[PDB]
Design a protein around this ligand. Structure first.
Ligand SMILES: Nc1ncnc2c1ncn2[C@@H]1O[C@H](COP(=O)(O)OP(=O)(O)OP(=O)(O)O)[C@@H](O)[C@H]1O
Ligand SMILES: Nc1ncnc2c1ncn2[C@@H]1O[C@H](COP(=O)(O)OP(=O)(O)OP(=O)(O)O)[C@@H](O)[C@H]1O
Ligand SMILES: Nc1ncnc2c1ncn2[C@@H]1O[C@H](COP(=O)(O)OP(=O)(O)OP(=O)(O)O)[C@@H](O)[C@H]1O
Ligand SMILES: Nc1ncnc2c1ncn2[C@@H]1O[C@H](COP(=O)(O)OP(=O)(O)OP(=O)(O)O)[C@@H](O)[C@H]1O
Lengths: 431, 431, 431, 431
């Protein structure tokens, strides 16, 4: 089988080790019960993490056979930039978008840590994501995709485990009992692309961003917090974000880190979404992604000045589709690769230019300038009145056909046959 | 022919009379040259219009055989609400949307004024839209659609006319010469759904919202302008917006007028778009639509809590498609009616509920509450760990197929065959 | 729970009783083991069924508390006609289509039999579909959709059951042992809309239609079988198929039965498809649907003469999407209803006319005539050379933008910069 | 201007010279009137053309300054194969498809002949396509795309020309008068990918394929014509068609020529389509494309055995969209390149395998075998009954939401609240 319901005694088990209580207690438990756990910690540039190096040490202290720190920032930022280039975001509300930051983190974490484990001769994976969420499924697909012989063991869904220790307090009393010493209004996941806040009090639709203490930006909704308007420039070269406020970077990680600081000072990008889980039930989250939002705005502004209507519609439609696949843990499936590759090659390749913005609070900003060697937009941009008259006349054929259709629809009752207005009246409950 | 290149002497000609210099001079000229012009003015609830009644009088004074004021507010608001229900908006940049307010105005104006003219035995139409824009084509389609025998005469594209008087000063000197007495950094069109600002200085991408004196809201970008945060509630009943801040209205026109005041105090909805004209060339505009934006945000928030993923994706895809048809002057074509009707019946019908927002400046706002008897979202909402294990296992078949595809793509060079990362590397210029 | 793993002793259990060995043995077993089974047989107009009345009698003989025959033909044909109107078919190969006949049968069977059971105070359902196929899931969704308190019991996935009797021979020896007396190269499912043939020898891609003994048509691939060319006319009225060869019918069931005879004499509609199961693994089937195919061809021919390009594209795109939802057992989900309703109202409503065809063997036929009061097509159908010149000239703006894009793509290596042909060369493995 | 209304005396004019009466008379006339015409003939592998070499000679005899024969077969076949790989076909009726053969011919002809002309210092183009069709616009876009300074001169839309000689007889009397010596039920255009038949008697929907004398295949509808069943194998390697009946070819042109012979003996691929012109009016045509059809069938059969559901849906949707762009003369526009490139790279690259078919008459054939190293389909292809039970159970959340929606739709009147059937009844004219 793929999913082992019980602890594989004596077997080498890889654990995606975050360092929290859940994985610490599970690691200690798996060792105590006879398994040989190996710890793998992903450096994802978590904004509230200042000492990634201490994590593998705690894993060793708790029983890990070996513990490694895998740096995933470069790959994370590369995929985040690809998402920006593809507009691979689908959970939107009134124009505010969730930038699929956790989905991106799992795609890189799931593949890189499993590759690292297979490299160390480890073919069993364990991660603390619960059986009720999206993550459990994302890690599942990316892992089996990377290692065909990968088997999954999640002690948290093992009777023997859940039996004795099953709650937070249960795990804490367990650590104490094992000889080792050692709560918000919501849970937070984060990486350098963004932070998500969900569960607990955020489960209630009457809670709001007001109970959140943002970790990548300021509380822009608090009028007492001072936020000076700020001018910012964002420049792209062939789809690559290369300069912020005229400064370049040694690598994309440093660029994204700076994008985060700029948007962070304003709270740019924060949204509140009710979304659909992979298991077709809804969930609610409050999200942060200051740098992604900054790049996304500049990218789209350039896009509107550089590409034609049909190409921009493909960016939107293929982008939304890709966003859903990314969210489902299918970022590397053939249908996703095809959409991503096509958008990167034909849309992003031409995105060269610079956008100037004035940022104030949250999502309030203004566009101040747009420049590009590739613009198809031109001020006061060729044809005569007579050329237009002919073009207008060529429309008569189709207008006549449409007029006949309206007559036919009125006849069959879809449009009111009695409309002393001139405005066709569609016959449904709303009109 | 349909488009008459020269003035039809002695013939009754209908003129969409706005009251501006252009149509005033044209009316006087057409009468002077032998035609029998009839004036029709549409009451569209233009925000900067306080005396619609005086317009037909000026038409009479300038030579109109008869002049009528056609009230189009009810139809305008009805179509605007339908657009909200259908998310019929397509020009977006970073989540900021143009609400197709001029397109909606033309659809109602073009049909209603032509119906009024045909009613008075008038079968020739003239309107001052230039031969370089979208409007000329919108009025053309809606008119011929409403009156099969409609012929078009636009003096502004008549040699005899353009010859003598051809400029603004030319027309002004013409009025004076005819015995009658009588400039911004951009041109403005507006109706009660919104205001558009384009041309002149706005043709330059280095101009911005800063040179605009908004007519439906405040200058939220001016830090010296004081804008108190404000809580607002918006309630829908079966897709119909029925209450604002707990108050109902005698009709939808009054509701929209109030929505405008609420969003106006904050500058909600304002955007800057580079878009594609019907003639496939780009144009730039700065837009206002405070009430539409307010309703749009609340509607979408409810939508995310009430409908499933596939239904919401149809709202987005069909909505964007509909927005483009609306923009092209095809709001009543069969393909548009089908999308609009389907969305009104199956999506809007279930949109019942109330959304509470906190508005600050421009597009900076927060969602404070979302309630609905039709929510499918439920706090802490059924299945066991074992149920999930089986569901996860059912994925293996497709994961194996995908793994084989990745192998095949690496083999054919689409993915790097040499990737010591674990993260598949797509082979294109961006990666 | 929803799915009962073990027999609910003493409880009333509803069984979708087909009369085959599987359900006969299961019914006898469930009674013998203490449950109180009720039998429900759906009359679906199975082509190879001549005595539906005897089925409930055999159920009574085997232990059914009560047995009913539910006529589902009218609903089946109504849904089949809706599918035709919506082009709700998605498994196609070289233009040959699977008409989703089993999916349609399950939607009507699953809802109607469950309603019948709930009517008799029965709230547990059992059906013999295996745990490896699509059907098990289709019946599951339609049942719970119709009865919220419905619980599922499938003895075939019950250890106690599978234990003792688990094979065909096991069940046969069981009947004998219980006091009652009593194999092709593939399995067949069928209803009056079509017949499916799959499994066994058809699992192999080197098998073909040659091993199939069609039950709704002749062996058109056998040159020794004589098939006279035949002229046939098909007439629709507002989307409803009303006449075949000039004759009308007392109801749609009789019309479909005649459509089947006409197409059957030729083998019209037969296809061989490799498709994707709901569980994302592939399956292979050989299908028959002579009447559906006949109506589908005539409907589409009229569609091409009556509706415009955008409307026809929506028919194809929304139709394919709907076909997939139908196949998944989601024919009544909101996203499906929206697509189906929109197509029926705006596309089908205008389909009035008659198509004449000459049928020969299999899918070889010719179109001989197409007539319709609603045609927008007209022989030698308005504009001048000068009108076209202007229209062509209006294209220059976009052509220039496209030329600049080609230059940009060549520059970035997507198109060959070295092409002494004039034909742009896309840079990928295929060119 | 771009389109010259009158003959540019003394100027070098390039003429796409087919050799027919129309271009022969125009060439002679343009020389006689003072222009300096250059002739360019495209070798497109026209099936009914046995002496392409004589064409430029006749051009020289009629006054051409120089005349060249440009071989376009290789490029034509390359683009035709790309279309097959992308399923770039959109005019379909009952599964029968028009393979966009003229659109492909114009894309190669328009670009290659203009490049040849610009090469000879010729910057004015003339072609005999009428102002009422699609071709005039296709040649227009491909030409200006290839040569920015290209100007168009079509004598057929020149008053001076149309004045004196305007009809066929007029042109014939003209040739005689100039010292040179020298009708079906429809017009035919053709190249090695296919033949189109339209106009004249085919304008009437009561005409049929029976009045057509096919030029690429036999009259399969004539029962007296003997057509022996034939087995054929088609093999692809990474999307490239490489073998037919086990034989390979020196180049793709020879392969396509053989594909044509094979399908031609049976009349495979012939269809009758009512379609929409670029100018939104309908037209009718009868088409031949035996080789394209043969490759298309084999390609799709392999596609169904190799790619997953989402990837196949993209092939269909993106393919149909691409087909429309191709038809409009936009085969090289950015939105087309993006769709074509994505499909070639991610779908076609994996199409390796062989399909065996039995061809009889017209579109009647059977699939006999399908093999591929890349198949994801496998006979008797992993999961247990318990795994399926859990997977089925995970559906309850969404089923409950859907049940609530049905209740809501019944409440708002979209579904009958009174349905003693169990089958939800959609409330519209069709049900
Ligand atoms: N930086 C990291 N390195 C390695 N593994 C990690 C890292 N961050 C998270 N994980 C793994 O992912 C699991 C889930 O993450 P986390 O506990 O933060 O999520 P959550 O908010 O509880 O949501 P869910 O349970 O749905 O995943 C952790 O138990 C751990 O196995
Ligand atoms: N309220 C109205 N009632 C009747 N006709 C109107 C009204 N508003 C505008 N029109 C008609 O529409 C024409 C175009 O409107 P307007 O002059 O405001 O547009 P514009 O900004 O110049 O842009 P364009 O020229 O592209 O339309 C006017 O010349 C007039 O004929
Ligand atoms: N006419 C009918 N009336 C009632 N129930 C039926 C009828 N036809 C089929 N069924 C039910 O559907 C079940 C599955 O049908 P059948 O055995 O014909 O399918 P199959 O070819 O074995 O494929 P699968 O197992 O995937 O359904 C039967 O066991 C029976 O419960
Ligand atoms: N092989 C060729 N080489 C060069 N030019 C060609 C060739 N075939 C066709 N053309 C050009 O295309 C024009 C149109 O082709 P043709 O006359 O065959 O089309 P048609 O059936 O009359 O339809 P339409 O007028 O709509 O193009 C010809 O007048 C000629 O200029």
């Amino acid at each position: 089988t793929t999913i082992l319901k019980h602890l594989p005694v004596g077997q080498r088990i890889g654990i995606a080790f975050s360092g929290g209580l859940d994985t610490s207690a599970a690691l200690l438990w798996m060792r105590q019960k006879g398994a040989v756990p190996y710890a793998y910690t992903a450096n994802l540039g978590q904004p509230d993490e200042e000492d990634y190096d201490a994590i593998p040490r705690r894993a060793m202290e708790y029983g890990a056979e070996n513990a490694r720190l895998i740096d995933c920032r470069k790959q994370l930022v590369a995929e985040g930039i690809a998402a920006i280039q593809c507009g691979a975001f689908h959970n939107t509300t009134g124009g505010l978008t969730y930038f699929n930051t956790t989905p991106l983190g799992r795609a890189v974490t799931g593949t890189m840590l499993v590759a690292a484990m297979k490299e160390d001769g480890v073919n069993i994976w364990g991660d603390g994501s619960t059986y009720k969420g999206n993550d459990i499924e994302r890690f599942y697909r990316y892992g089996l995709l990377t290692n065909a012989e990968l088997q999954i063991y999640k002690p948290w869904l093992d009777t023997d485990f859940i039996d004795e220790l099953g709650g937070r307090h249960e795990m804490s009393e367990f650590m104490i009992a094992c000889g080792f010493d050692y709560e918000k209004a919501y849970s937070t996941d984060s990486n350098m692309l963004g932070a998500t806040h969900e569960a607990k009090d955020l489960e209630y639709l009457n809670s709001s961003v007001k109970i959140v203490n943002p970790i990548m930006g300021v509380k822009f909704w608090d009028e007492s917090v001072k936020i000076p308007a700020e001018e910012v420039t964002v420049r792209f070269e062939q789809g690559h974000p290369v300069a912020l406020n005229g400064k370049t970077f040694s690598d994309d990680v440093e660029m994204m880190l700076e994008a985060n600081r700029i948007g962070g000072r304003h709270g740019l990008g924060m949204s509140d979404q009710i979304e659909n889980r992979i298991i077709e039930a809804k969930s609610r989250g409050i999200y942060e992604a200051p740098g992604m939002a900054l790049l996304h705005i500049a990218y789209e502004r350039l896009l509107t000045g550089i590409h034609n209507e049909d190409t921009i519609e493909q960016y939107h439609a293929h982008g939304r589709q890709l966003g859903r696949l990314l969210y489902q843990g299918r970022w590397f499936d053939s249908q996703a690769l095809m959409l991503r590759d096509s958008l990167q090659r034909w849309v992003a390749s031409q995105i060269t230019g610079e956008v100037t913005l004035e940022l104030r609070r949250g999502n309030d900003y203004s566009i101040l300038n747009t420049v590009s060697e590739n613009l198809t937009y031109k001020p006061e941009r060729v044809f005569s009145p007579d050329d237009r008259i002919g073009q207008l006349t060529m429309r008569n054929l189709d207008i006549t056909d449409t007029r006949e259709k309206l007559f036919g629809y009125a006849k069959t009752g879809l449009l009111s046959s009695s409309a002393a207005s001139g405005v066709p009246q569609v016959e449904n409950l709303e009109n």
